[PDB]
Amino acid sequence: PPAVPQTFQVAHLHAPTGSGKSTKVPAAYAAQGYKVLVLNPSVAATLGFGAYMSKAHGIDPNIRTGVRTITTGGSITYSTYGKFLADGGCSGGAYDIIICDECHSTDSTTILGIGTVLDQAETAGARLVVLATATPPGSVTVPHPNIEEIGLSNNGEIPFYGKAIPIEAIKGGRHLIFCHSKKKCDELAAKLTGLGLNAVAYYRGLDVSVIPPIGDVVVVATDALFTGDFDSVIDCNTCVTQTVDFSLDPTFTIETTTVPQDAVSRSQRRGRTGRGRSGIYRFVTPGERPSGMFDSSVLCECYDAGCAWYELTPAETSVRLRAYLNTPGLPVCQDHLEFWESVFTGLTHIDAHFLSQTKQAGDNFPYLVAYQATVCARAQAPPPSWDQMWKCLIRLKPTLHGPTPLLYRLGAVQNEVILTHPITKYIMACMS
């Protein structure tokens, strides 16, 4: 619980997990007349705190979200970054303290949003602006005595990234596997379900409904993160993240490449254990990786998204993205600001009906995949392939043939690619 200076200040509340950061601290604040606003990357977290904050603290916070919205009138508003950017940001929000929580996040939304805070807060009327996070940019993983950090040897057979988890000893108690991809995910889960190890896990687009409860059974699951008492975890130490490449063929190639886990995705994976009691931590490679900068690709999404939903011209999404940079204790990446801002300023006259469709079904890059298919339909030319990605062109299959006027490799490709579409050209020049 930092000061509340009458002037202005940007406080960093670097406190560990379960400290009550998104529940107690605000409450402290909301007991002095100060009107507070707390932001969080996930809905399920927002709506979460939104209750634990009422049924055990005597407060009824307004809970703003896309899937749910509740207005009480309390001076504590638990909403989310996305839903915050959606509501126009602070553009209409009178708050005296703002807490960008979990700010260690490198996702399109946190960033753009935090950037939105960092810029408007100051004049929106805010008196303090808090950035909380268990694991901030830089700070290294710490030996938490509340977690029996135990190795991982190959005194078995069950192939696991190397340190083949011995089966003879490993049965299932309270453990919890941590994987990288969706595929190889269940690939193991069942490889042991023929023994008792359910294959349960959370992917990208599922309900917590698929969660156990009792029975000393081991579970699997990807990064995005339930029930059953996690008093142990088996991290794979292989994080996977999209990484832009400038392959000039004819332009970039947003490709999801795997890699060693930094510090934030190392201790966050250890943030889901040591709960309730003296947790345990299983890991293959001990060493983590210096965290602080995030790939430039993400710098694209703010632009792709900010353009898709939040309605921010490449221009706006910049300044916001700017202010977020100049601020301390927050991650960074190469200042490809001017380039990217460059690209989108041009990608004009996107077909309304394709953005709408693409975004709806939540496609990684809604605006970019909705543009690569406007040019594709005005040129009666098919898209780079018929993956579920270009489903928006489905109704045009009858009238569409020839080569694909490729604007950027956003994944698989299967047609003659012509690299001359006036735009492709623009984007090239923009690349220099």
Next chain:
Amino acid sequence: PPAVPQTFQVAHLHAPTGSGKSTKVPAAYAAQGYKVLVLNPSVAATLGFGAYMSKAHGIDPNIRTGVRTITTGGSITYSTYGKFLADGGCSGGAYDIIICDECHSTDSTTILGIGTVLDQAETAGARLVVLATATPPGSVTVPHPNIEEIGLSNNGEIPFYGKAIPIEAIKGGRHLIFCHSKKKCDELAAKLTGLGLNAVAYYRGLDVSVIPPIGDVVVVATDALFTGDFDSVIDCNTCVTQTVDFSLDPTFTIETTTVPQDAVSRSQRRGRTGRGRSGIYRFVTPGERPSGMFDSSVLCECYDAGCAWYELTPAETSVRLRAYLNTPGLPVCQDHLEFWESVFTGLTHIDAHFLSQTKQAGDNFPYLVAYQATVCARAQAPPPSWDQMWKCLIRLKPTLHGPTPLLYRLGAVQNEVILTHPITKYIMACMS
């Protein structure tokens, strides 16, 4: 009105809607000695011309539809493509001039209708075939003389496909809203009726009466809607259609999807008002998509509705359709005629009970739904799911175990399945 050449000829009309393409053109051919047949796709519209021609034209035409029939013995004949088909098509007929009104629609029937007539007419003694319309392929919305087109913003208390409707714009008069789904219609009307607004949800099934004829009113209705005399027509711009998506799992799939309106659909709704007393049109997503094309869905639905309703050999159907890809001016599609034909000839010994049951059920793909039933029972195994589509398999539920022999994803498969059935495999191979 075109001339009836000494030789045989297929003409093309393009008069704007309501100029006699289906009223004056015929009367003319009639006031000469030519026996005219006029096909339209609507059972309603059909009976409409009968009355009209009489009320003022001094011509008692014989009508032919499902619900009725009225044979006055006169040369001008009005009839649906549905009834015309079922009447053994043109083959069983001697008409001098066959006008295929509304030849731009793309429904199982209206197509077989033209294919048949475009294939038989000549050899049947026909003198002329006139494909009429006022929105041929490659056509866009031409501004309505007396209809201001306004867009939608965010100034609105009521949501609406991303945009909002300013209550103020719908507080006086008779307004018609257009929503893709009835499921949605119901809601959007409620919210409005709770705002002291006279809301009435209308769609397939309901009683046309619900809609009052006087007083202020807003109709949250779906395509199915004259005496309505509406002031404005807010439109959701999206539309719903069925698409086939070959997905070797194990053969294909026919899911219903919500896709953007084509120039046509955006001219039936926009024109639901402004007719007579100057009205207004209000949209969400600007720029209408173009017309004239139809997903392989239709081609299957033909063979199906051609084995089920009109009782026609997969061979014979192709025969009819073959005379459609050919004639120029009619909508386009992928030439899968050879494929879809294969997939059917194999589907034999359908359980007539199930077929009849399904036909009399309104099921979209009856012959396809029944065969998956037929082989289901035939093999003593349950249907994919128990949606109100398989209803025909209840007296057997007890005597039904094991995984479903999935011939094709045509609905929502909710059961352990297999894909080794001799038939599944067949089509799978017919997949060429």
